[PDB]
Amino acid sequence: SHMNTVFSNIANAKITEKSLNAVWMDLFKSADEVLMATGYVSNDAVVELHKILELNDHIQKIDLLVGMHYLEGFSHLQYDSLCKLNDFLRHEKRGAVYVSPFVKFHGKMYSFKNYQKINGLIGSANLTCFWDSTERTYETMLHLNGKPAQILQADIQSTIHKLGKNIQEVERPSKFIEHNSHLENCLGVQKIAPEQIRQLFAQTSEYHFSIPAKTEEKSNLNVFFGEGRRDKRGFVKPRPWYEVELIVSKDITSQEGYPVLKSFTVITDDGWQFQCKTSGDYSKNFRSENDLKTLGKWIKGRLESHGCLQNNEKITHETLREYGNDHFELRSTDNPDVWLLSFKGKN
Amino acid sequence: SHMNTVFSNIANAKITEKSLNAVWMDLFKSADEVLMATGYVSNDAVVELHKILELNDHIQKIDLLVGMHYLEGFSHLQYDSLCKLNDFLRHEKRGAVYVSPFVKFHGKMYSFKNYQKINGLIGSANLTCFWDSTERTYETMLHLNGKPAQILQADIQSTIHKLGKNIQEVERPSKFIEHNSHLENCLGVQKIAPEQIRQLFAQTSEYHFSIPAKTEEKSNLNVFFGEGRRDKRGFVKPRPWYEVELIVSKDITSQEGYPVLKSFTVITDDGWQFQCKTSGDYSKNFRSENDLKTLGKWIKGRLESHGCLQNNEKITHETLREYGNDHFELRSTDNPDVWLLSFKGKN
Numbered sequence: 001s002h003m004n005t006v007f008s009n010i011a012n013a014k015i016t017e018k019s020l021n022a023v024w025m026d027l028f029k030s031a032d033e034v035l036m037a038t039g040y041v042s043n044d045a046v047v048e049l050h051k052i053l054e055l056n057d058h059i060q061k062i063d064l065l066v067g068m069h070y071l072e073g074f075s076h077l078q079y080d081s082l083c084k085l086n087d088f089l090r091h092e093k094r095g096a097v098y099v100s101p102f103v104k105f106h107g108k109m110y111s112f113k114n115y116q117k118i119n120g121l122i123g124s125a126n127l128t129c130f131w132d133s134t135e136r137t138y139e140t141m142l143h144l145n146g147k148p149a150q151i152l153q154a155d156i157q158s159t160i161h162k163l164g165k166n167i168q169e170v171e172r173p174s175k176f177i178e179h180n181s182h183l184e185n186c187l188g189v190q191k192i193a194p195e196q197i198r199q200l201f202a203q204t205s206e207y208h209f210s211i212p213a214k215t216e217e218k219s220n221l222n223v224f225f226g227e228g229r230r231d232k233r234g235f236v237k238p239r240p241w242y243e244v245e246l247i248v249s250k251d252i253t254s255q256e257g258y259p260v261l262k263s264f265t266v267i268t269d270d271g272w273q274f275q276c277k278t279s280g281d282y283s284k285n286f287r288s289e290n291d292l293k294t295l296g297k298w299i300k301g302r303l304e305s306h307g308c309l310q311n312n313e314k315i316t317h318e319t320l321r322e323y324g325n326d327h328f329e330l331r332s333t334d335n336p337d338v339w340l341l342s343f344k345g346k347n
Numbered sequence: 348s349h350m351n352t353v354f355s356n357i358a359n360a361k362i363t364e365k366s367l368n369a370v371w372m373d374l375f376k377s378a379d380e381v382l383m384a385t386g387y388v389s390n391d392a393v394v395e396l397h398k399i400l401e402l403n404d405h406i407q408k409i410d411l412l413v414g415m416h417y418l419e420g421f422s423h424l425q426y427d428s429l430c431k432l433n434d435f436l437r438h439e440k441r442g443a444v445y446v447s448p449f450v451k452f453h454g455k456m457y458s459f460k461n462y463q464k465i466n467g468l469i470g471s472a473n474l475t476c477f478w479d480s481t482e483r484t485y486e487t488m489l490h491l492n493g494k495p496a497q498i499l500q501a502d503i504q505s506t507i508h509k510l511g512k513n514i515q516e517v518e519r520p521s522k523f524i525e526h527n528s529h530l531e532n533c534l535g536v537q538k539i540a541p542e543q544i545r546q547l548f549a550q551t552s553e554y555h556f557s558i559p560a561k562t563e564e565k566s567n568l569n570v571f572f573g574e575g576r577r578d579k580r581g582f583v584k585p586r587p588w589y590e591v592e593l594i595v596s597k598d599i600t601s602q603e604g605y606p607v608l609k610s611f612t613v614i615t616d617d618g619w620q621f622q623c624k625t626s627g628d629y630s631k632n633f634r635s636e637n638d639l640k641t642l643g644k645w646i647k648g649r650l651e652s653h654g655c656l657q658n659n660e661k662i663t664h665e666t667l668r669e670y671g672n673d674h675f676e677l678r679s680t681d682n683p684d685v686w687l688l689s690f691k692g693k694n
Contacts, residue, residue: 107487140454
């Protein structure tokens with residue numbers, strides 16, 4: 001009773017009464033102090049947590065132990081985002097980010113302090129965008145309340161004291177693991193071998209469109225910098241880092257052969273397959289269909305991998321210039337339901 | 348209470364009363380039925396679990412869900428080991444191995460039944476050689492007994508029923524990911540960049556020894572096939588797959604410059620650094636000092652990555668012939684405490 005199983009409950013495998021992301025967010029929203037211990041983190045999870053703490057004053061203290069990365073390997077984007085979060089927390093005296101220099105720490109544990117009420121979660125789930133309602137992996141946690149949660153809270157605190165070192169206080173890693181956007185973890189995404197891609201892109205297309213990468217500061221590709229959504233309790237959530245809005249002008253959607261108001265398969269020059277869909281006024285909105293984030297991860301992830309885009313940064317005319325491309329190429333195949341999409345850099 | 352936190356308690360961070368590997372083994376040893384759900388597995392963990400069930404009759408039923416690999420990627424060795432385990436379980440009517448074809452299942456959950464008494468673990472730890480007393484990562488679990496353990500057991504059962512498909516019943520994976528021995532997860536191992544290695548091995552050595560890869564069937568490199576360890580109760584553990592005994596003849600250790608009865612740094616042709624140690628009569632025994640398994644993982648993992656050695660297989664001279672090498676090269680540097688160790692195949 002002081003214990004409840006809490007699973008992801010996706011994929012027609014609804015096992016537990018409540019689902020992970022909703023429970024985590026519920027506990028996070030009402031808490032005034034949080035302890036987090038994770039094995040891994042992603043750049044967007046960290047950057048978005050950072051904005052969330054910027055946008056909501058409810059968390060008075062937050063401590064985050066990142067356990068695996070110091071010894072196993074950081075991307076520069078992960079490392080810098082954590083440093084940047086730490087800077088904020090320190091300057092606002094709202095807590096700290098720790099790494100684990102003495103051991104590869106793999107635990108996933110969360111404690112939420114609401115006044116005198118304590119809730120805990122412990123299981124498989126690393127720190128992700130729990131504030132994204134789309135769950136992509138099936139995780140299993142155990143929710144604790146009352147006195148057992150109190151015990152877990154102290155054990156998390158002990159972990160931080162004995163294993164954790166303020167990330168500010170450690171030597172910045174000499175070598176980084178290269179940035180991996182992990183597009184394969186987006187829902188509805190397949191990898192296509194380079195040989196298939198070569199043969200598939202060899203063909204000549206009947207229809208060919210060149211769609212501008214837009215450079216608006218707070219919308220389109222940069223909606224991340226636009227206004228966040230406020231929930232009923234007043235919690236403000238930023239728009240996701242890997243969400244873009246690809247909005248195609250009438251000048252193009254009106255052209256012969258354009259896939260208007262249609263679902264279709266897209267295959268990318270760098271070997272990814274996923275369903276997209278056009279919709280809205282003048283069929284302007286071009287979207288990845290199974291996962292909101294696929295299209296944005298494809299676009300921003302490529303920019304990030306070339307070193308043209310980093311944390312918390314707007315795509316500008318200069319981003320595209322340095323990358324070597326300012327358009328997305330959308331062209332047909334002999335199949336009216338399969339299209340090719342390219343965003344090749346100068347390399 | 349019906350709950351206890353159970354952590355690894357390594358790296359001078361002893362936080363919980365009992366430590367993970369010891370608790371898991373204790374519960375495993377007392378059980379007549381086990382339910383296991385994991386995100387990941389390694390080839391040796393599966394092969395050794397398989398050997399454990401071969402050697403001990405106490406487990407009447409075991410169900411094993413492997414959650415991540417089917418959709419994310421199998422190595423041939425992981426896939427083959429699980430299939431062989433399933434084959435055994437099917438033939439003995441002692442349970443089954445499941446994969447997760449419909450979702451990337453990442454949970455880590457274990458349920459142990461002793462008569463009618465149920466014990467459970469839920470947290471961060473994937474299936475490893477829990478029967479190896481050395482923990483290499485700091486993991487965090489929550490132990491359940493009584494009615495809460497009963498609940499977790501039912502939820503594990505549901506997970507298997509809703510997500511699991513018998514590995515016998517799924518299409519063989521189209522592509523395998525390359526075998527990764529993950530030597531970096533051995534204690535006391537550092538990685539050296541290919542550029543430094545190239546410069547380091549360019550030097551000429553004053554001392555040069557060529558150490559035969561021995562082909563004894565049940566000892567030396569093949570101690571895995573030797574006798575296992577029996578504890579007080581008669582529970583049999585096989586000798587670890589990645590344990591080898593590198594035994595060097597008097598003809599070699601008696602030679603000028605051989606590192607007798609001393610610890611020294613070893614750097615390998617494929618970019619790994621770790622301390623080794625010579626000991627015993629005539630400095631006969633050559634060992635990884637910080638982690639018993641490093642040397643065997645280095646030697647066998649290379650044979651495995653080339654496809655010259657497979658699951659549950661003894662190293663023979665034909666293994667070595669197919670590989671293209673039957674000797675380990677140990678030669679000096681200008682530092683008498685730093686040595687070069689090579690095992691290149693024809694490749």
